[PDB]
Design a protein that fits this description.
- This is part of a larger assembly, with 9 protein chains of 9 kinds.
- Chain D has helices at 19-28, 80-101, 107-123, 168-178, 185-199, 231-241, and strands spanning 34-39, 42-48, 65-67, 72-78, 132-140, 144-150, 156-159, 161-164, 210-216, 225-228.
- Chain D has 244 residues and is of the alpha+beta class.
- Chain D has one domain (1-244): Aminohydrolase, N-terminal nucleophile (Ntn) domain (Glutamine Phosphoribosylpyrophosphate, subunit 1, domain 1, 4-Layer Sandwich), CATH 3.60.20.10.
- A 5-stranded antiparallel β-sheet of chain D has the order 8-1-2-9-10.
- In chain D, a hairpin with a 3-residue loop joins strand 5 (132-140) and strand 6.
- The longest helix of chain D has 22 residues, at 80-101.
- Chain E is of the alpha+beta class.
- In chain E, helix 2 crosses helix 3 (102-118) and helix 4 runs antiparallel to helix 5.
- The longest helix of chain E is centred in the middle third of the chain and has 22 residues, at 75-96.
- Chain G has one domain (1-250): 4-Layer Sandwich (Glutamine Phosphoribosylpyrophosphate, subunit 1, domain 1).
- Chain G contains 6 helices and 11 strands.
- Chain G is globular.
- The N and C termini of chain G lie far apart (58 Å).
- With 240 residues, chain H is an alpha+beta fold.
- Chain H has 6 helices and 10 strands.
- Chain H has helices at 16-27, 77-98, 104-117, 166-176, 186-198, 224-238; strands at residues 31-35, 40-45, 63-64, 69-75, 129-135, 144-148, 154-156, 159-162, 208-214, 218-221.
- Chain H has a 5-stranded antiparallel β-sheet, with helices on one face. A 5-stranded antiparallel β-sheet of chain H has the order 3-4-5-6-7.
- In chain H, a hairpin with a 4-residue loop joins strand 3 (63-64) and strand 4 (69-75).
- The chains are: A alpha+beta (241), B alpha+beta (235), C alpha+beta (195), D alpha+beta (244), E alpha+beta (231), F alpha+beta (243), G alpha+beta (250), H alpha+beta (240), I alpha+beta (111).
- Chains in contact: A-D, A-F, A-G, B-E, B-H, B-I, C-D, C-H, D-E, D-F, D-G, D-H, E-F, E-I, F-G, G-H.
- Chain A binds chain D through residues 2, 5-6, 122-123, and chain D through 2, 4-5.
- Bound molecules: chloride ion.
- The site of chloride ion has 2 residues of chain A, from helix 3.
- Chain C: Belongs to the peptidase T1B family.
- Chain C: GO terms for molecular function: endopeptidase activator activity.
- Chain C: InterPro entries: Ntn_hydrolases_N, Proteasome_beta2, Proteasome_bsu_CS, Proteasome_sua/b, Proteasome_suB-type.
- Chain C: The modification Phosphoserine is found at residue 76.
- Chain C: It comes from Saccharomyces cerevisiae (strain ATCC 204508 / S288c).
Chain lengths: 241, 235, 195, 244, 231, 243, 250, 240, 111
């Protein structure tokens, strides 16, 4: 039974190492969510600092890949940082060679192709991560593109990743079934972040403090992460209505 | 399966130990060192009477002052001999002198452990390297596939080795002549060989300071065999 | 080296090649054979830079002999000439080209025809009734243009060749020490020992 | 490390056989039968396509018979994809020879070259062998008309008549019975089709389940012509010989 | 068991069995003792023969004028590692006009052995080494294990029955460290130390091998009748 | 089963058992700690005295990278040395190209990516060490700890090895009782105490204390070993607290 | 490191089977149904856009891909394998043909190149076969319209019409009854939509179906005017609206 | 590159891959070599399971390495071609660098060295082939006959056989071949070679190939009728 | 253009006696018309009772001597502390020099 150790086909036409890489994705027990506004793309993720000895400022699964592209990862941090470093290198190389900023969907495809190679070549293992890329693309506007260990990728109106992804997914599905639009009809990114947090609270059924969340925001020509105080201001506004 | 350079729980390289078993299956080769010279003798062991026995070359010249006998997978020895001859003549090129027997042996033994996953396995042959130099005089070395080499006053390798070595234990002394050593090799070869010893199925050789390395004629060996028979019948 | 001539008559090919070898200001040898048998019915003469000529000829010889053994079959003169041309055309764009000009005289046993090929160091091949390399043609081609017929006998070919060598010996400044003449026909290759 | 997952494709069995070569031959035995028959005035190549469909575009299809050059052709039995790798190499070798010697490559020399490539995969590299058996039909001015076969072992042999693929045991017996040395192409065509018609696993032998080719000196004067038969032409020869 | 097939595999308890098996080869090897004072450092080695006709396998190897080692285990591996030290000692001299520090020599051996314990295909070294030397910070003694672990010590012993000599040195610690400016007495302490590891056999003239290095003493090896003085 | 026989193989859990087995080698090693202070970091390690024959203060375990970074580790010592050698190559090439000395977070990722790379193939073995490291850069003091998986985080206090639980408990008290912060000289004293308290897990053999530190005020942001009077002062403070 | 898997991962078993190819074909069988039909004046290829989530924008995932202006491709099986094959197929059409001959390759030769790549993944060291079957439709001047299937083994066959994946057995039977040599392109599109409806469970509309054609030259899609010989691509992807219009006349 | 050690020692000191290569030789058709006083003859079996064969173009069992040396074999046919090619290249390489054709002993030593190299090189398996190499050294009238095998050992033989049922024909040669007086003529040498094959072959029709090599590059292959006359004469004397 | 060679002047002299030998050399080192050093040793004791001097381009001379001294060291290691005879040293130095046949050590050497 060596067909389960390396990335070759089983009799069922399956790749068990790819399937087990998907399972490693939930090892951190963290849930992430991404939504699109009019002018922005917001990504939120649970932040869990169990050890008091940890420096909480260094505990992060959100990455600034380029000035325009942000990336949140679902999976172990070593593989997450492996993917992050490669995406940064690819984004920079792209700009140098082709004279313009690498689009979010193009980077997603590139990283997805690299992941595909690990599913076909035996000596390389798949990375146990799901990568969610976000930006406000200059051609496509607000963009969410997500990659997984199978080498699969696709664009999203909104998305969720983690152990409780289904609960969040259905919650978002039900909202977009009402509004009948592909985004959050809101002017400011602040209110889009408030929407994202509010709907994660409702879906998971847990309250959040400023240190329980981690937020990334993509606007035209920049992606940035929010500080704890920026998130607190966001949580106050939610509670006051 | 398992690595080629793997250690056993006892702290030995499996492949090296297994190559030693192949050497035990080989034909007998004996070396005796004296102050008048070093004698090298081998069992030819022809597999059939139609095989022309003189083409069996298990004793070999490395240089004028160094000879070599082999036992085990004798095909593996050819590259070792080629390296030895090259090393010997190359040193003569660089230093305008004969090379020390020990240094030659060390050069051969450096090849031994160059295997892994370089060649794919250790050598399946042991060598008796006999020679003479001005510094250490007449010398006999036993080069193994482990990369280890011991100097010997007398040594037997091959299928009848432990029986021959026990016999060499009793017979060897520091005042042996060359003629006495010749008869002693023939005596012990005749003891451990399956077939009856004669000039066609056994070969002698020696290395002296004056004449250098010489393989003995079948006519010359035949007389030494006849001389042996008579002296054993004498008491 | 200096002068190599070739002529294809009715039933044979005749190659004449100078005997001189010079280093510095001294003629080291006056009996040098500037030719190699490539196969029983194929002969190649050569001329060019010192050392390169023999090395190239022997390298070609080895390759054709290898082919002969592998297939148990003699390559046609045309096939051999094409092989040689490609090697020279390959050589001219190398780091250090082989500066060798050759004539290939062969008898095709299949077609029952003699064949003469002229190839220079660039890989320039031409099939000819008569040929030469270097300055040899400047003196000899006018005689060959005049006297040559395709139905000539081997003896008439040798007489016309003698006239060419006599003209060379008269009007060339260099002493090339006479020529070794070899005939290639259906029976193989033989040397004319008196010329 | 990686050693764990190595199948070791280039090793002997205790009996002195090459496992992968033997298993490749087992694969080939399930392939559509291909037959070659050599006559005094030409060579016939006949081959059976495997369980086809009505929606398969036959006139543009080629799975059995391939052209190596103007003088030489091959019939394939085994993995088609593997065969195309080798075919393209053989096409290049023939052109290399033509460029070098300015003469068309002798049949055997081309066959030996391809067979040597197959041999290499059984002795070194650690790769699986090509699951292909060829029937070479060719002509040159040394030996004239020639039939050869090669298999995954890299061993090749010459033949007057031969089959590869499925039911070769039955097919070879039938060929051995009716073949004669003074035979002609038109007779050989009939023998080839009759042999396939009896050995086939299908219910009936039809034009859409066949590929057919001939190498004839039946070209205007001293020269050779290759004829890859069209679907309609295979249909006509089936009626002519009295099979359909 | 299932985790001893190669050097690239940890066991469930975090052990590297191939390294441990290489360590086993050292225990089978003949005993060798190392000890030092503030002025000199001494190696003492019990050489082993195949039989009575055979010579006694050499145990001590010179690396530079100020440095050398004794071996226990696979002799060819010691030749490789000693050759590496010879080159490193020599690189330091030719490039920096600097005698290689004994501590740095240990660090280089550690790193060389380590690469063989983490990569596939290769194997760990099957030999233990005792390195002595005298550099700018005085006399030194190092113990090398093919796991990569190198340790600076006042005295030690490796090989079969080495525990006896090691206990003796642990008692004698305060005495032999003070033997300054007296090479013969320091050797005596080493010969007396290695004697605690002997059974049946005793120290003969062609059995014993001694080496010494010090303040005004280049690394020199003593064999044959040169060690009869100490028997 | 068989998922634990080869590195870089995911088990059905999604785990790399070979990396988890490497952690066992780390847990087997001696105790090492790190303490972040007001303007720098302090490192300390437990050195087991296997024998009287060991020369005191000679077998140095803590290693410097560049001139501003300190590295200590527990587990297979050679593996740690290999990692530091790489770290030194990484720090050198960074300074070569960018002029400025490597920032601690930047350096941390260089080690992280290298350790993580040794979990991607079956042709290599994971590192048998957890490494505590850090120093002072332009943005101030940083302390990190790096595991065999390649995982690392920033820390207020860090501990690894056989006595890690005992150490962690002691570190947690310091964090609670000193929210405003801890001074460099205090951290050296506390570091000594924690190693002594953590020695109860290796109480069979006696040990030798080794401390180092980088501090903006006390060492000008350079890595230095704690020696002489300052070391003895820390040992005395530690010995007083256990009694 | 180094790729130490220099040996084949696909090997012959005692029965003569190449296991990894068979298992790859099994993965293709599990894949979503796709089909191709050849008409007299065109070719059509079609498949279902099986969306993994309703939040996912299925327009961004293209199952039907342009390889050259006159050649298109669709698949059944593993999507990521298909995506990289399209990247390589597009590139090989340039490197091994267009940069040599100054024109795009004919359908059969591009198929031959794709087939070769897939064969090599079946024999080369340290790789598994591609887990896809491709349907490649195309047009070229001298061969006209053509439709090819390419399997994991590297074998390729020309088809008048065919189907691969989930409900291929039923779909091929459906096509055998409807296909003839006098079909116009619109008739083939109609038959394609009928055939594809049988294998689809849920929604069946322009947003859930992906369909492209190889047909007449599209000068409106060329992007420039001025060169008479350049008349535009024959490959065209049908829009969501264009599909829905033909579903009313279904 | 593929570096896998396929030929390795087993606990009992055997290299199984080399020994299994000998089993491939045991399967191969019988080949025999007999040297007379002024000649050497190489006999070869052709298995009659393969009829409808084209004997003009089918690879002959005896191969010329040079004009004065020949090579026959038993075992894998495809493997033998690689050794033959290498041998032929070395023969021309020797003439080119030393200006003398190879001796039979030298050529044998080279081929044997190649076989040996494939027993301790990574990623390769041994040649499943044993060879009989025969000929006459340049300007020498003493016959030469050598044998090689997969392990790489070689030796000289007065007479030798290899391949399937070689045990039987060797038995015949051991009692029939006299060293003191070898086959004085070509006839006697060929007759003894045919007789030896008739112990094993089955039918004496197209199953026996004979190749006579004489001094000074005089090599000829006997035809079917010439061999058939030997087969006829042998059995007529046997009926007594 | 960069000239890799230079001339440091100096002169050396070797004379062989019946049971002794001398190797002498001046201690002046120069470039062009300037003096670099009035005392820069040029003749060296290389061990094994051998003395050597490589005169001409000092950089190449120092490199050669340094390499031969190294050759002596490795001769002892490889051949059981055997003494390197003068004839063996000479032959060894020939190979050191010819290793740079196409970028020569610009020195006249005497031992
Ligand atoms: Cl890509």
């Amino acid at each position: 039974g060596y067909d389960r150790h390396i990335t070759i086909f089983s009799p069922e036409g399956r790749l068990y190492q790819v399937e087990y890489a998907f399972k490693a994705t939930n090892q951190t027990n963290i849930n992430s969510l991404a939504v699109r506004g009019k002018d922005c793309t917001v990504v939120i993720s649970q932040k869990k600092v169990p050890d008091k000895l940890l420096d909480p400022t260094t505990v992060s699964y959100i990455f600034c890949i380029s000035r325009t592209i942000g990336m949140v990862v679902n999976g172990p941090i070593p593989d997450a940082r492996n993917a992050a470093l490669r995406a940064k290198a690819e984004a920079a190389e792209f700009r140098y060679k082709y004279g313009y900023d690498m689009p979010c969907d193009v980077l997603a495809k590139r990283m997805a192709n690299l992941s595909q190679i690990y599913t076909q070549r035996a000596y390389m293992r798949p990375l146990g991560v799901i990568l969610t890329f976000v930006s406000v693309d200059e051609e496509l506007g607000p963009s969410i593109y997500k990659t997984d260990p199978a080498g699969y990728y696709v664009g999203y109106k909104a998305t969720a990743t983690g152990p409780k992804q289904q609960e969040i997914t259905t919650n978002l599905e039900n909202h977009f079934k009402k509004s009948k639009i592909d985004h959050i009809n809101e002017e400011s990114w602040e209110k889009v972040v408030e929407f994202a947090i509010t709907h994660m609270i409702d879906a998971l059924g847990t309250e959040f403090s400023k240190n329980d969340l981690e937020v990334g925001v993509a606007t035209k020509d920049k992606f940035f992460t929010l500080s704890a105080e920026n998130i607190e201001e966001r949580l106050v506004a939610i509670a006051e209505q | 399966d398992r690595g080629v350079s793997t250690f056993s729980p006892e702290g030995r390289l499996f492949q090296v130990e297994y190559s030693l078993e192949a050497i035990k299956l080989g034909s007998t080769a004996i070396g005796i060192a004296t102050k008048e010279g070093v004698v090298l003798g081998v069992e030819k062991r022809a597999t059939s009477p139609l095989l022309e026995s003189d083409s069996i070359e298990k004793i070999v010249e490395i240089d004028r002052h160094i000879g070599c006998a082999m036992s085990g997978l004798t095909a593996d020895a050819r590259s070792m001999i080629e390296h030895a001859r090259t090393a010997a003549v190359t040193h003569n090129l660089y230093y305008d002198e004969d090379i020390n027997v020990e240094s030659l042996t060390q050069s051969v033994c450096d090849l031994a452990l160059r295997f892994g996953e370089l060649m794919s396995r250790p050598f399946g042959v042991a060598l008796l390297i006999a020679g003479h130099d001005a510094d250490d005089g007449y010398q006999l070395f036993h080069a193994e596939p482990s990369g280890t080499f011991y100097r010997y006053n007398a040594k037997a390798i091959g299928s009848g080795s432990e029986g021959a070595q026990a016999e060499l234990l009793n017979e060897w002394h520091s005042s042996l002549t060359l003629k006495e050593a010749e008869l002693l090799v023939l005596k012990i070869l005749k003891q451990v060989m399956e077939e009856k010893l004669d000039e066609n199925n056994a070969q002698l050789s020696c290395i002296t300071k004056q004449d250098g390395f010489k393989i003995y004629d079948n006519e010359k060996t035949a007389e030494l065999i006849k001389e042996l028979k008579e002296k054993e019948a004498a008491e | 080296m200096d002068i190599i001539l070739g002529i294809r008559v009715q039933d044979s090919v005749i190659l004449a090649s100078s005997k001189a070898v010079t280093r510095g200001i001294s003629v080291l040898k006056d009996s040098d054979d500037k030719t190699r048998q490539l196969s029983p019915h194929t002969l190649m003469s050569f001329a060019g830079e010192a050392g390169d000529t023999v090395q190239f000829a022997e390298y070609i010889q080895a390759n054709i002999q290898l082919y002969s053994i592998r297939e148990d079959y003699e390559l046609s003169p045309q096939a051999v000439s094409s092989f040689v041309r490609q090697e020279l055309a390959k050589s001219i764009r190398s780091r250090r080209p082989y500066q060798v000009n050759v004539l290939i005289g062969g008898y095709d046993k299949k077609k029952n025809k003699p064949e003469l090929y002229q190839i220079d160091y660039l890989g320039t091949k031409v099939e000819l009734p008569y040929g030469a390399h270097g300055y040899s043609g400047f003196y000899t081609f006018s005689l060959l243009d005049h006297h040559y017929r395709p139905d000539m006998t081997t003896e008439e070919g040798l007489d016309l060749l003698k006239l060419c060598v006599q003209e060379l010996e008269k009007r060339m400044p260099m002493d090339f020490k006479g020529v070794i003449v070899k005939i290639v026909d259906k029976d193989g290759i033989r040397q004319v020992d008196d010329f | 490390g990686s050693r764990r997952y190595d199948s070791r494709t280039t090793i002997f069995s205790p009996e002195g056989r090459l496992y992968q070569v033997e298993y490749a031959l087992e694969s080939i035995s399930h392939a559509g039968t291909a037959i070659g028959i050599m006559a005094s005035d030409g060579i016939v190549l006949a081959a059976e396509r495997k369980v086809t469909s009505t929606l398969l575009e036959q006139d543009t299809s080629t799975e059995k018979l391939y052209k190596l050059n103007d003088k030489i052709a091959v019939a394939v039995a085994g993995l088609t994809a593997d065969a195309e790798i080798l075919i393209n190499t053989a096409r290049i070798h023939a052109q290399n020879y033509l460029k070098t010697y300015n003469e068309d490559i002798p049949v055997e020399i081309l066959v030996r070259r391809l067979s040597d490539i197959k041999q290499g995969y059984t002795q070194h590299g650690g790769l699986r062998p090509f699951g292909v058996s060829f029937i070479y039909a060719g002509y040159d001015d040394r030996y004239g008309y020639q039939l050869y076969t090669s298999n995954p072992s890299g061993n090749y042999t010459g033949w007057k008549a031969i089959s590869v693929g499925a039911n070769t045991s039955a097919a070879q017996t039938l060929l051995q019975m009716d073949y004669k040395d003074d035979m002609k192409v038109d007779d050989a065509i009939e023998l080839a089709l009759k042999t396939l018609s009896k050995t086939t696993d299908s219910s009936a032998l039809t034009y859409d389940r066949l590929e057919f080719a001939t190498i004839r000196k039946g070209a205007n004067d001293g020269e050779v012509y290759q004829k890859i038969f069209k679907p309609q032409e295979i249909k006509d020869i089936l009626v002519k010989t009295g099979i359909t | 068991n299932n985790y001893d097939g190669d050097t690239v595999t940890f066991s469930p308890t975090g052990r590297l069995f191939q390294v441990e098996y290489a360590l086993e080869a050292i225990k089978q090897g003949s005993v060798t003792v190392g000890l030092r004072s503030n002025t000199h450092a001494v190696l003492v080695a019990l050489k082993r023969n195949a039989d009575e006709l055979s010579s006694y396998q050499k145990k001590i190897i010179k690396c530079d004028e100020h440095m050398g080692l004794s071996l226990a285990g696979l002799a060819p591996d010691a030749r490789v590692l000693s050759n590496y030290l010879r080159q490193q000692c020599n690189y330091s001299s030719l490039v920096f006009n600097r005698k290689l520090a004994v501590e740095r020599a240990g660090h280089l051996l550690c790193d060389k052995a380590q690469k063989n314990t983490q990569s596939y295909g290769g194997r760990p070294y099957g030999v233990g080494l005792l390195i002595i030397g005298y550099d700018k910070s005085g006399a030194h003694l190092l113990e090398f294990q093919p796991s990569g672990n190198v340790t600076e010590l006042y005295g030690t012993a490796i090989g079969a029955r080495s525990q006896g000599a090691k206990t003796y040195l642990e008692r004698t610690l305060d005495t032999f460290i003070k033997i300054d400016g007296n090479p013969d007495e320091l050797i005596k302490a080493g010969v007396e130390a290695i004697s605690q590891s002997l059974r049946d056999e005793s120290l003969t003239v062609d059995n014993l091998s001694i080496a010494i290095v010090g303040k005004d003493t280049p690394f020199t090896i003593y064999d044959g009748e040169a060690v009869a003085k100490y028997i | 089963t068989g998922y634990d026989l080869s590195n870089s193989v995911f088990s059905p859990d999604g785990r790399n058992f070979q990396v988890e087995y490497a952690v066992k080698a780390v847990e087997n090693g001696t105790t090492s700690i790190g303490i972040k202070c007001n303007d720098g970091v302090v490192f300390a390690v437990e050195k087991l005295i296997t024998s009287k024959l060991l020369v005191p203060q000679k077998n140095v375990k803590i290693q410097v990278v560049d001139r501003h970074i300190g590295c200590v580790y527990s587990g297979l010592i050679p593996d740690g040395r290999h990692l530091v050698n790489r770290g030194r190559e990484e720090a050198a090439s960074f300074k070569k190209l960018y002029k400025t000395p490597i920032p601690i977070p930047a350096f941390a990722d260089r080690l992280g990516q290298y350790v993580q790379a040794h979990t991607l193939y079956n042709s290599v073995r994971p590192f048998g060490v957890s490494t505590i490291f850090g120093g002072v850069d332009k943005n101030g003091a940083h302390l990190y700890m790096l595991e065999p998986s390649g995982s690392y985080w920033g820390y207020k206090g860090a501990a690894t090895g056989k006595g890690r639980q005992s150490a962690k408990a002691e570190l947690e008290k310091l964090v609670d009782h000193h929210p405003e912060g801890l001074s460099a000289r205090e951290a050296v004293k506390q570091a000594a105490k924690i190693i002594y308290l953590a020695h109860e897990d290796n109480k069979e053999k006696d040990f030798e204390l080794e401390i180092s530190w980088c501090s903006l005020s006390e060492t000008n942001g350079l890595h230095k070993f704690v020696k002489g009077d300052l070391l003895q002062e820390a040992i005395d403070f530690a010995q007083k607290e256990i009694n | 490191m180094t790729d130490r898997y220099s040996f084949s991962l696909t090997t012959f078993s005692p029965s003569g089977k190449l296991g990894q190819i068979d298992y790859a074909l099994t993965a293709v069988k599990q894949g979503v149904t796709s089909l191709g039909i050849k008409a007299t004046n065109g070719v059509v290829i079609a498949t279902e856009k099986k969306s993994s989530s309703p939040l996912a924008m299925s327009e961004t995932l293209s199952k039907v891909s342009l390889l050259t202006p006159d050649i298109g491709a669709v698949y059944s099986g593993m999507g990521p394998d298909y995506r990289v094959l399209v990247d390589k197929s597009r590139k090989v059409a340039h490197t091994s043909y267009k940069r040599i001959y100054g024109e795009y390759p004919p359908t059969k030769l591009l198929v031959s190149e794709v087939a070769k790549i897939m064969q090599e993944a079946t024999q080369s060291g340290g790789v598994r076969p591609f887990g896809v079957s491709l349907l490649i439709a195309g047009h070229d001047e001298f061969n006209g319209f053509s439709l090819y299937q390419v399997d994991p083994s590297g074998s390729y066959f020309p088809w008048k019409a065919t189907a691969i994946g989930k409900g291929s057995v039923a779909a091929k039977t459906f096509l055998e009854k409807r296909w003839n040599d006098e079909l116009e392109l619109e008739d083939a599109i109609h038959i394609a939509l009928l055939t594809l409806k049988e294998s689809v469970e849920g929604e069946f509309n322009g947003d859930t179906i992906e369909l492209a054609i190889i047909g007449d030259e599209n000068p409106d899609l060329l992007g420039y005017t001025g060169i008479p010989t350049d008349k535009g691509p024959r490959f065209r992807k049908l829009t969501s609206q264009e599909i829905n219009d033909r579903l009313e006349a279904l | 590159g593929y570096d896998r050690a396929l030929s390795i020692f087993s606990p009992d000191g055997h290299i199984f891959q080399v020994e299994y290569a000998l089993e491939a030789v045991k399967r191969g058709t019988c080949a025999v070599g007999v040297k007379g006083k002024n000649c050497v003859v190489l006999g070869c079996e052709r298995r009659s399971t393969l009829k409808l064969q084209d004997t003009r173009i089918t690879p002959s069992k005896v191969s010329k390495i040079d004009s004065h040396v020949v090579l026959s074999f038993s075992g894998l046919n495809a493997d033998s071609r690689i050794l033959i090619e290498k041998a032929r290249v070395e023969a021309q390489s020797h003439r080119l660098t030393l200006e003398d054709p190879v001796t039979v002993e030298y050529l044998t030593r080279y081929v044997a060295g190649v076989q040996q190299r494939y027993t301790q090189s990574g990623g390769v398996r041994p040649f499943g082939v044993s060879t009989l190499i025969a000929g006459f050294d340049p300007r020498d009238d003493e016959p030469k006959l050598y044998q090689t095998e997969p392990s790489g050992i070689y030796s000289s033989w007065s007479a030798q056989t290899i391949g399937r049922n070689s045990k039987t024909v060797r038995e015949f040669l051991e009692k029939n071949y006299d060293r003191k007086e070898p086959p004085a003529t070509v006839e006697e040498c060929v007759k003894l070679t045919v007789r030896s094959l008739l112990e094993v072959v089955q039918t004496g029709a197209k199953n026996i190939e004979i190749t006579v090599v004489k001094p000074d590059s005089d090599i000829v292959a006997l035809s079917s009728e010439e061999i058939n006359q030997y087969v006829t004469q042998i059995e007529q004397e046997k009926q007594e | 253009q960069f000239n890799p060679y230079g001339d440091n002047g100096g002169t050396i002299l070797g004379i062989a006696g019946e049971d002794f030998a001398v190797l002498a050399g001046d201690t002046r080192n120069i470039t062009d018309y300037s003096i670099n050093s009035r005392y820069e040793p040029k003749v060296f004791d290389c061990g094994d009772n051998i003395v050597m001097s490589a005169n001409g381009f000092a950089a190449d001379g120092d490199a050669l001597v340094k390499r031969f001294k190294n050759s002596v060291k490795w001769y002892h290691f490889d051949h059981n502390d055997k003494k390197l005879s003068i004839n063996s040293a000479a032959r060894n130095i020939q190979h050191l020099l010819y290793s740079r046949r196409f970028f020569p050590y610009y020195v006249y050497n005497i031992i």
